[PDB]
Amino acid sequence: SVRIQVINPNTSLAMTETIGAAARAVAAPGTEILAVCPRAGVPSIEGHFDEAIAAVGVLEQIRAGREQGVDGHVIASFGDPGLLAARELAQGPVIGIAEAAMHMATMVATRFSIVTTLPRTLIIARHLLHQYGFHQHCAALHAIDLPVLALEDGSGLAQEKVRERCIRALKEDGSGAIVLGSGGMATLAQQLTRELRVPVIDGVSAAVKMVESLVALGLATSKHGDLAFPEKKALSGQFQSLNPF
Amino acid sequence: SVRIQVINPNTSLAMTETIGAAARAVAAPGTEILAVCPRAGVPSIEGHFDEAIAAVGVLEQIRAGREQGVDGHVIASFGDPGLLAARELAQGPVIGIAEAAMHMATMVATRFSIVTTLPRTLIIARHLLHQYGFHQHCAALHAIDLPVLALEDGSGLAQEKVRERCIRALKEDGSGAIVLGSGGMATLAQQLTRELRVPVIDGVSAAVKMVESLVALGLATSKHGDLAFPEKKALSGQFQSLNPF
Amino acid sequence: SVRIQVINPNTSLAMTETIGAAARAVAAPGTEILAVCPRAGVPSIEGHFDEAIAAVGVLEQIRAGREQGVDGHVIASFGDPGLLAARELAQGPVIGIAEAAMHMATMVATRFSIVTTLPRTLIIARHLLHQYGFHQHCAALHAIDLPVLALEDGSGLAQEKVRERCIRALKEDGSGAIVLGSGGMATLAQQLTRELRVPVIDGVSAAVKMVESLVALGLATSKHGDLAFPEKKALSGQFQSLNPF
Amino acid sequence: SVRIQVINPNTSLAMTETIGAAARAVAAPGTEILAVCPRAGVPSIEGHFDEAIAAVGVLEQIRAGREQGVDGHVIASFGDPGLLAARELAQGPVIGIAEAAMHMATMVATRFSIVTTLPRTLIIARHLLHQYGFHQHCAALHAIDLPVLALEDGSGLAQEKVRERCIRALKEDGSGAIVLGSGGMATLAQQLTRELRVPVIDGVSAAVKMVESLVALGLATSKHGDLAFPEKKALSGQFQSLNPF
Amino acid sequence: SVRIQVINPNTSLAMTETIGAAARAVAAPGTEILAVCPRAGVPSIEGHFDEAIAAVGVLEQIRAGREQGVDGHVIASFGDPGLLAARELAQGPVIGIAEAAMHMATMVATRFSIVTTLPRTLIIARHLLHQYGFHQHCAALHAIDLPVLALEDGSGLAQEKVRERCIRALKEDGSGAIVLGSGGMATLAQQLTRELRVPVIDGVSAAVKMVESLVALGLATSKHGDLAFPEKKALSGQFQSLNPF
Amino acid sequence: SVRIQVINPNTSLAMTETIGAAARAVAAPGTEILAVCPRAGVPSIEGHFDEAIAAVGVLEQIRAGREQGVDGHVIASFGDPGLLAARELAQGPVIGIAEAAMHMATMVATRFSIVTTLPRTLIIARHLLHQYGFHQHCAALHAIDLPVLALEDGSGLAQEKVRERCIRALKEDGSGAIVLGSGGMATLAQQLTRELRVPVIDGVSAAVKMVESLVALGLATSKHGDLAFPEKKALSGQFQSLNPF
Ligand SMILES: NC(=O)NC1=NC(=O)NC1=O
Ligand SMILES: NC(=O)NC1=NC(=O)NC1=O
Ligand SMILES: NC(=O)NC1=NC(=O)NC1=O
Ligand SMILES: NC(=O)NC1=NC(=O)NC1=O
Ligand SMILES: NC(=O)NC1=NC(=O)NC1=O
Ligand SMILES: NC(=O)NC1=NC(=O)NC1=O
Secondary structure: OEEEEEEOOOOOHHHHHHHHHHHHHHOOOOEEEEEEOOOOOOOOOOOHHHHHHHHHHHHHHHHHHHHHOOOEEEEOOOOOOOHHHHHHHOOOOEEEHHHHHHHHHHHHOOOEEEEEOOHHHHHHHHHHHHHHOOOOOEEEEEEOOOOHHHHHOOOOHHHHHHHHHHHHHHHHOOOOEEEEEOHHHOOOHHHHHHHHOOOEEOHHHHHHHHHHHHHHOOOOOOOOOOOOOOOOOOOOHHHOOOOOO | OEEEEEEOOOOOHHHHHHHHHHHHHHOOOOEEEEEEOOOOOOOOOOOHHHHHHHHHHHHHHHHHHHHHOOOEEEEOOOOOOOHHHHHHHOOOOEEEHHHHHHHHHHHHOOOEEEEEOOHHHHHHHHHHHHHHOOOOOEEEEEEOOOOHHHHHOOOOHHHHHHHHHHHHHHHHOOOOEEEEEOHHHOOOHHHHHHHHOOOEEOHHHHHHHHHHHHHHOOOOOOOOOOOOOOOOOOOOHHHOOOOOO | OEEEEEEOOOOOHHHHHHHHHHHHHHOOOOEEEEEEOOOOOOOOOOOHHHHHHHHHHHHHHHHHHHHHOOOEEEEOOOOOOOHHHHHHHOOOOEEEHHHHHHHHHHHHOOOEEEEEOOHHHHHHHHHHHHHHOOOOOEEEEEEOOOOHHHHHOOOOHHHHHHHHHHHHHHHHOOOOEEEEEOHHHOOOHHHHHHHHOOOEEOHHHHHHHHHHHHHHOOOOOOOOOOOOOOOOOOOOHHHOOOOOO | OEEEEEEOOOOOHHHHHHHHHHHHHHOOOOEEEEEEOOOOOOOOOOOHHHHHHHHHHHHHHHHHHHHHOOOEEEEOOOOOOOHHHHHHHOOOOEEEHHHHHHHHHHHHOOOEEEEEOOHHHHHHHHHHHHHHOOOOOEEEEEEOOOOHHHHHOOOOHHHHHHHHHHHHHHHHOOOOEEEEEOHHHOOOHHHHHHHHOOOEEOHHHHHHHHHHHHHHOOOOOOOOOOOOOOOOOOOOHHHOOOOOO | OEEEEEEOOOOOHHHHHHHHHHHHHHOOOOEEEEEEOOOOOOOOOOOHHHHHHHHHHHHHHHHHHHHHOOOEEEEOOOOOOOHHHHHHHOOOOEEEHHHHHHHHHHHHOOOEEEEEOOHHHHHHHHHHHHHHOOOOOEEEEEEOOOOHHHHHOOOOHHHHHHHHHHHHHHHHOOOOEEEEEOHHHOOOHHHHHHHHOOOEEOHHHHHHHHHHHHHHOOOOOOOOOOOOOOOOOOOOHHHOOOOOO | OEEEEEEOOOOOHHHHHHHHHHHHHHOOOOEEEEEEOOOOOOOOOOOHHHHHHHHHHHHHHHHHHHHHOOOEEEEOOOOOOOHHHHHHHOOOOEEEHHHHHHHHHHHHOOOEEEEEOOHHHHHHHHHHHHHHOOOOOEEEEEEOOOOHHHHHOOOOHHHHHHHHHHHHHHHHOOOOEEEEEOHHHOOOHHHHHHHHOOOEEOHHHHHHHHHHHHHHOOOOOOOOOOOOOOOOOOOOHHHOOOOOO
């Protein structure tokens, strides 16, 4: 059996449930999803300050996952907070949802467009594009100008704004696919794909498949050099529980 | 059930058997592998001239796969010949082995090294690095200075040269993983991974998992814009059978 | 005397005549133009599938040119299909028309705009910009949204649409020159240059001058390393005639 | 008067004293240095896991600095952990020591070389080079293969290894200046500059001057868009004290 | 005491006075500003021809500054003409105003917009962005379509056009700061910063602070390799006075 | 008839004669070469200071050429000093020898190596590679560590050092062609091409062919936007004769 810990980096249990449901919907036979969120942190991630807090919350759950002996990890917010930090701490592979969505997009289209939540998160997505090397593959980046948690507020306004922005993107951007720029849009991907007749990609589902793929290939994070286990040292105060290994 | 057509772009049946075996070894339950090679073409791909011939052979098999109604396709040589051409013709996703190996490498290491066959193929690998956007993620490229088919000649010389070059790469390059730069090295990946304690990645096995992943996600090649079906026109002579749809 | 084989990669004899006329119009004293097209292939090139077919047709004519002992070769479609493959097979220099037009544009302007045929060919032009290294030198890319062969249909609609798009480009793009993105626009270049008072560049005429230049300099394709003659191997079926040397 | 909070992101008081001394040595008349370190965290930063912990410790001190009404902030470790997060939280400018050292290097030399502590920190420095846009300005990156705190162990071994590596860099790399890749090397910069007759740059001292410069120019972090104050939300557990504003 | 030679590369005494006033307004206690312009040259710099003339005028003043034994130099036009040439000739640091403004902008914002004078100077600013490595940090470049000296013509039209363009930039570009693209806009920076509540940066004032910073750090131009004193040779005619050292 | 002004940017008449001879050796029937050098300037160009002086000397000769009504211009030193300035002033096309050599190299090889004079000129060549967009096409840059005028000193030492460095480059660099990095190496190109059996390219001869090509194509520098004639203004002192038009 394969056990994958899907970590929502924010403390919203509502978003954790949406992310968890999306992960189970595409999970292969024999795969168990462990949908979790940090005990302490931020309800939504909307900037660099929120990401720095989320990164430590991710590491808290990574530690818990490694203690449980899970096969892999997913970081389920579009900023992929603490990705490389998590890879150092974890033995199994760690996949970010932005990373996974962008990787899948290059396999089904020449260029993709990103539709995300707030304007101030666009720069974070731009940095990830350069970091992962997909900047040339991204035709345009768009924000719906609503807070992250608007996707969970029951109104359906954010979902409709994503839909409308996806249609506009396919007409103007010169792209063949859409990358959804939030973990909250996870369930909207399958509906828009069928409706718009183009790949509309959710990173949550994509990252699950990447972990499953790597485990089946017998591949895990390289412990040689850059992503080796953290150097042995004493952590103080609030951080002392992060590395008991 | 999932049916994946794994196309060896060269006409070597020996290499087709090695590629086919590697694909079946990692295939998920319910996945059938259709290992094929072109009826006409080149025995091995060792340059730009060979690639141009291989690309048309790929398209010949893509057509056959689409007629059979396969779920996806794999292009099983490290130059990914005719990748975008194949995506236009095929309905299901088409994944190159260089593409897949490089994508997996960025998920398990910060930087990777490439170990391939001939010096003259290095430029092709360099172009693909820039095209896919992984140039910054590649620490170094290496060639063992033996012809592609030396991996099939039974001597074990090419296999030992790959091993020795992998050890040297991990010591000098400042990389955490190895990408094997040939479809003939497909079976060597699992042995070197266990022996060297680092991810040594085969593109053949990786591409199979990518096709399986995309099919499970309900994602296929975008037929909107760049990778749309080829424009309706009459093909003459040797090419007339390529697009009966 | 200098003999230059100008290869139209598509099978349209009408386009071959337009390309041939443009080549002879700028040819230096003592230069003979051999305007040719493949015996088998595609009537027009409008995507990646068409390019893969065209590349082999180019190689067929390259072989014929080398047997005849021509001094150089021109690949006369804006995707420069099979350029590096042709350079391996040929002894004399091989120049693509996109390559040549872009090279000339950087010599007469700081930045240039591209005006081509179909929207789906734009990505091909974008890839060539990155491959040749002129991406920063290209201010914008534009398509007239008509099929390639509309330039040969006698209506004059495509020609007028190119004209109108050239005027708009010079006003909006912040560029000093125009690169015509088709072999069919070859004869329109001189008229628009005089009319718009800016360099409007045809790749066909430019590539002829590049071949003439290289021959006069006593320079041909390097047979050391990457562009060396293809490795000796047996080609099967439809490809057996490609390398009799 | 100008008050600058210099934050050592690690919990080593020994390194905090070295950093504090370097800051006061170059401080302009009327400038008070507030040398601090986090109450909880990691003794030294040697990888991505350490950086994620350090980033939150930085934010803890940023909050304290803003409450005190300081004019600016310095992040005094070569990974510039939590730089953009700190800029969101703080009103005054926040300057990283890697950022500052690299900025100064481009003003006194065409290209610079980096001499840092551990091999595994090189990738972090490489990422910062790309992020800040100085990758082309960096000729080479070097590590002395000793832990960060070796600079504080009293042996003088790390200091001598830095010296020897600086001499080798100036001979081999083709660079005109050296950037010291640690906050612990802060006091070594002035000695090597005089001895080697080239700019050997400490980021700590450089960042102090940048804060002083920006304050004198009447410039602070832009609160429009990306680096605006964090969105109002409730932080839980260990993070609740980070944003009382 | 610190003496900084601020060189206006154009021969406009009116612009020299504006530049000189801006330099003195931010100068630290003990700093003397030597505001100068060339004896021969061009009244305003509006293209590549003007820049080549200005570069030699800069060198003329650099020589004068070095003879006087000044601590540093500022090149006070947005094209930074003869920057590297000046660094070779001078002993003290030489800072360009475009260089300094761009460097400061990356410290207070994620991305910046440029507002300059003429459309034809935009390409010069684009080249400097690539040369200094801040191309990714620049969201947009804008020109007010008025000659450089319009800022000195007393009408206030150019100043109002800069203001209006700054407001439009902050609304459309997705940037957090403005870089003023002329030495004539030097005094407008402080007013727009207070009015628009964002960093509006003048390169003249910024470059002064950079020179002061480098002098306090005990850092000057590297005379090892690329920016070494010019090779000893005899200059003829109009240039004979440029290198008496 | 076609008249091409070949400008040696340095004041060495010996180098002017070598450059002039190389230009006439490849000149087409009907082409007259006007080999010139500035009346005032520097005997050799070995750094940024020398280039700034050379640029104005180029403009002096450009003015003379335009008054004479020449068809085009060549800037015959490997730094292409004042290239864009010259294009503004001149009506006919202006081609740099570094520009031309690099352009030809991409047409005959995948990657090229540069062999130049002094180590301190390498950075200038590196900047031109980035500016022209051929950085990825350049495998390596090499300097023979002799002054520029050593090629004219009659010893044959510099010529032998170029030869030896060319052989080493072809063995180590992984390149297919050599670009000679000086106007003094102009006559060595044909001998090394025949001897080493690879393209060894002289920029002087290449630039002549580019001017001839552009004239035959009826193409000249764009006077729309960036390379328009310099704005009408009064030049003072030593520069007053530069723009009488
Ligand atoms: N919406 C985003 O851009 N990032 C996110 N913030 C979250 O809290 N979850 C996300 O995916
Ligand atoms: N070895 C390679 O670099 N490319 C290849 N040529 C082949 O025939 N198969 C390959 O994978
Ligand atoms: N128009 C293009 O973009 N490419 C072309 N297709 C052709 O058939 N000829 C071309 O030049
Ligand atoms: N030495 C480094 O590369 N980074 C650092 N780790 C620390 O603890 N301080 C540093 O400057
Ligand atoms: N306005 C500019 O873009 N450049 C300049 N020309 C000048 O004369 N001074 C400048 O700053
Ligand atoms: N050798 C060079 O790199 N540049 C040059 N200096 C000159 O004087 N002529 C050149 O070509």
